[PDB]
A paper describes a structure:
Enzymes in the [name] family 48 are believed to be an important member of many bacterial cellulase systems which also lack the better studied GH6 and GH7 family cellobiohydrolases produced by most cellulolytic fungi. All [name] domains have (α/α)6 barrel fold with nearly identical organization of the active site tunnel. Out of 36 residues that represent the tunnel walls and contact with the substrate/product, 27 are universally conserved and most of the rest are highly conserved. To broaden the structural database and directly correlate activity to structural features, we have characterized and expressed two [name] domains from C. bescii and [name] and solved their structures using X-ray crystallography.
Residue numbers in the entry: 2 to 702
């Protein structure tokens, strides 16, 4: 019974015996502590994880008719990770002094962390913020009602929580230094920097920016646009399933209103204005790209002498972060979450359309979704390369925001968004729309994607791959993208396999609208690296489930592809159940990347010394000079030296001895096998739980 499987996993996730949550009721990234992938420690948590918790409680609340758990989850989010604390210290002091005519001061991004700190030069005057005034008039405040992306839930970095000292969970930041700063190469620092850690008199600021003076003490937060959007997607469903408490519905509306900051160029530069390398400030909504960019960030002074604040949007947009179910919820009567601001719903209505166009634009010749686009080439408004394809005057990028690893390689970035487009096809059809350009785009995209993905899903069979991760056909040749991929397969009862990554080449054609789409014959996805990721399985299932269900609502029966998607869904759910260990549905994974715990690649500028949260001097003596080819002049320490408390982790020992016995520092290769782990990730187990739930709701009933 899929309903019983849902309830079982729900209770495994929620059980105080299992450790998915902290003593303060806050979900962790994972049960295990020793893990690094986007958070850099398993008992961090993310806005991601909160949004998934919400999704979990909505479906539970549906089945039990008790919405208390959803409300408690929202309350917990508000208390610990949204930096608005009406009835306590102000967690955004001096936000009121924000200047919407000069939202922030320009600085260039750099191609390597070695080139930071970047000068706050104001070379490009920032454009007008056109939504500040609406937000103030609507809510009586400009305090940002969005989740900060990263919380140190056990205070493992030891910074404490300055503006709320009785909370153990402290707001922390990592990424700050451009597209080559992997998770391994960032330096964790407190969002609220009173300069009591970091370099004396400077805190951590001077790693990242230079200005004429010593940096003032200051605070800053950064959301992740897909997380707040998923929170809103969850509440969409809650309301569809009967939830009707306007106290919480209104909070989702407010979150959606502030999420519009995700639609603006970093420095409010006119969209397209940097095509030839000479950007200029936006007027009205001229800096609105109507997509969800990677983040919005906001900051200001700490203390009585620092009466200023600032906001940035972002210029880089990744397909994988778009959420058109949230956009629909926020923009129509049937969606039900339209904000009360003058243009919130209408901005989201445009976004819904632009998101769908972006997916169609980015879809490869064989059906996979390519990375995205930017309004700030190289992150400094460089002129677009000759011949570069564009989308609304923004340049195509195969790896938006991050290159280490390239951000659209992971197959999870296919499942996540296509799950939502599937949902949206279903939503549109259920709402009586078979004819709009929006439904035709959503349908066309998901239909082609489903066809695409089914070539690489194996249940009870094991695909044949080579040593470099390529899938092989029955004649033993590499399968290098293309439609009608026929992967060689040996019998393997009880196993499942999914693709792990895509290797991208080429470009889409420049966008001219849906009626002119070319099918992008020059954009290729090579799908690779079979693996057993149970988070991705859960997301795929839902994609296939909602797609199947939509086809039946549309036509009266499962279509040809709809049948195949339903059957794949059912089969994946059936095999996955065997991998429940009593705590979650899990598999073992090799982590060849875990040499990066030990590699000296964490950059510090010359002349900078200070104290890390854990008490250690940084960069300290365990360093090598930075690579002169990366354009800096400083040093590298390692991830592990930076975080000496990691050596107290129970798993550290085995990792270190595995490194010592298997990794060859000379060749950069694991010679006697790579480290191996079985992780219980919060989001992954939610994606599996909700998969059983929705198959029950949409297909069984
Ligand atoms: O005139 C009044 C006073 O002015 C003071 O000077 C101010 C100045 O006015 C103001 O403009 C300036 O503002 C800059 C900040 O100092 C600086 O910290 C800020 O840097 C941004 C940076 O531009 C941006 O790239 C960065 O993005 C990070 C982000 O923080 C991080 O969370 C995110 O992580 C994502 C992961 O990549 C992803 O895997 C995961 O899912 O989600 C994460 C979240 O999305 O990654 C990105 C990079 O990709 O954020 C930082 C801020 O943290 O830039 C501001 C504008 O340039 O500050 C000055 C003070 O220093 C004077 O000092 C005073 O004399 C005057 O009175
Ligand atoms: O940033 C995307 C996403 O990454 C998740 O970890 C992935 C990682 O990207 C992938 O290469 C690895 O092999 O599998 C893991 C687990 O599915 C991470 O768990 C998320 O927090 C993050 O948003
Ligand atoms: Ca790097
Ligand atoms: Na709060
Ligand atoms: Na801990
Ligand atoms: Na407190
Ligand atoms: Na606490
Ligand atoms: Na990363
Ligand atoms: Na600064
Ligand atoms: Na994210
Ligand atoms: Na109420
Ligand atoms: Na409100
Ligand atoms: Na709409
Ligand atoms: Na398409
Ligand atoms: Na196909
Ligand atoms: Na294989
Ligand atoms: Na195109
Ligand atoms: Na992995």
């Amino acid at each position: 019974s899929n309903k019983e499987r849902f309830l079982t996993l729900y209770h495994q996730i929620k059980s105080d015996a299992n450790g998915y949550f902290s003593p303060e009721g806050i979900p962790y990234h994972s049960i295990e502590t020793l893990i690094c992938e986007a958070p850099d420690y398993g008992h961090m948590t993310t806005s991601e994880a909160y949004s998934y918790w919400l999704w979990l409680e909505v479906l539970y609340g549906h089945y039990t008719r008790d919405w208390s758990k959803l409300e408690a989850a929202w309350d917990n989010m508000e208390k610990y990770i949204i930096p608005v604390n009406e009835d306590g210290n102000d967690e955004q002091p001096h936000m009121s002094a924000y200047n919407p005519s000069s939202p922030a001061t320009y600085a260039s991004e750099k191609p390597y962390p070695d080139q930071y700190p970047s000068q706050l030069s104001g070379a490009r005057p920032a454009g007008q913020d056109p939504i500040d005034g609406e937000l103030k008039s609507t809510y009586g405040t400009n305090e940002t009602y969005l989740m900060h992306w990263l919380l140190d839930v056990d205070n493992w970095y030891k910074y404490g929580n300055l503006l709320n000292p009785s909370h153990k969970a402290a707001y922390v930041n990592t990424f700050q230094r451009g597209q080559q700063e992997s998770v391994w190469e960032a330096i964790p620092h407190p969002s609220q920097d009173d300069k009591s850690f970091g370099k004396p008199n400077e805190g951590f600021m001077s790693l990242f920016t230079k200005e004429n003076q010593v940096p003032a003490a200051q605070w800053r937060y950064t959301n992740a646009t897909d997380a707040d959007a998923r929170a809103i997607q969850a509440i969409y469903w809650a309301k569809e399933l009967g939830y009707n408490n306007s106290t919480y519905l209104d909070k989702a509306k407010k979150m959606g209103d502030f999420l519009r900051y995700g639609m603006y160029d970093k420095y409010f530069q006119t969209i397209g204005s940097g095509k030839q390398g000479n950007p200029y400030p936006g007027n009205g909504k001229g800096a609105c790209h109507y997509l969800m960019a990677w983040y919005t960030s906001w900051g200001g002074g700490l203390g009585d002498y620092a009466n200023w604040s600032w906001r940035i949007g972002a210029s880089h947009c990744h397909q994988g972060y778009q959420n058109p179910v949230a956009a629909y919820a926020l923009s129509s009567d049937k969606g039900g979450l339209k904000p009360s601001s003058a243009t919130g719903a209408s901005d989201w209505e445009k976004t819904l359309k632009r998101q769908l166009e972006f997916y169609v634009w980015l879809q490869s010749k064989e059906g996979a979704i390519a990375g995205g686009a930017t309004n700030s080439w190289n992150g400094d408004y460089s002129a677009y390369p000759a011949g570069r394809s564009t989308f609304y005057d923004m340049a195509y990028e195969d790896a938006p925001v991050y290159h280490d690893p390239p951000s659209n390689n992971w197959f999870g970035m296919q499942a996540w968004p296509m799950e939502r487009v599937a949902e949206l096809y279903y939503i549109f059809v259920k709402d009586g729309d078979k004819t709009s350009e929006n439904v035709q785009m959503a349908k066309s995209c998901i239909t082609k994607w489903v066809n695409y993905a089914l070539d690489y899903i194996f249940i009870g069979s094991r695909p044949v791959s080579d040593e470099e991760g390529y899938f092989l056909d029955d004649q033993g040749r590499r399968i290098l993208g293309g439609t009608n991929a026929t992967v060689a397969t040996t019998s393997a009862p009880g196993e499942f396999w999914l693709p792990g990554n895509i290797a991208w080449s080429g470009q889409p054609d420049t966008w001219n609208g849906f009626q002119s789409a070319t099918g992008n014959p020059n954009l290729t996805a090579v799908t690779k690296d079979p693996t057993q990721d149970t988070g991705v399985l859960g997301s795929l299932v839902k994609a296939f489930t909602f797609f199947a269900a939509a086809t039946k609502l549309e036509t009266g029966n499962y279509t040809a592809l709809g049948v195949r998607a339903k059957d794949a869904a059912a089969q994946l759910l059936e095999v996955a159940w065997n991998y429940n260990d009593g705590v979650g549905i899990v598999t073992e994974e090799e982590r060849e990347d875990y040499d990066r715990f030990f590699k000296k690649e964490v950059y510090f500028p010359n002349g900078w010394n200070g104290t890390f949260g854990q008490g250690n001097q940084i960069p300290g003596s365990s360093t090598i000079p930075s690579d002169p080819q990366r354009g800096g002049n400083g040093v590298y320490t390692s991830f592990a030296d930076l975080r000496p408390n990691i050596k107290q982790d129970p798993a550290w020992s085995s990792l270190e001895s595995k490194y010592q016995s298997s990794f060859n520092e000379a060749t950069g290769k694991w010679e006697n096998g790579a480290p191996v782990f079985t992780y219980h990730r919060f989001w992954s187990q939610v994606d599996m739980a909700t998969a059983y739930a929705e198959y029950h709701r949409l297909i069984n009933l």
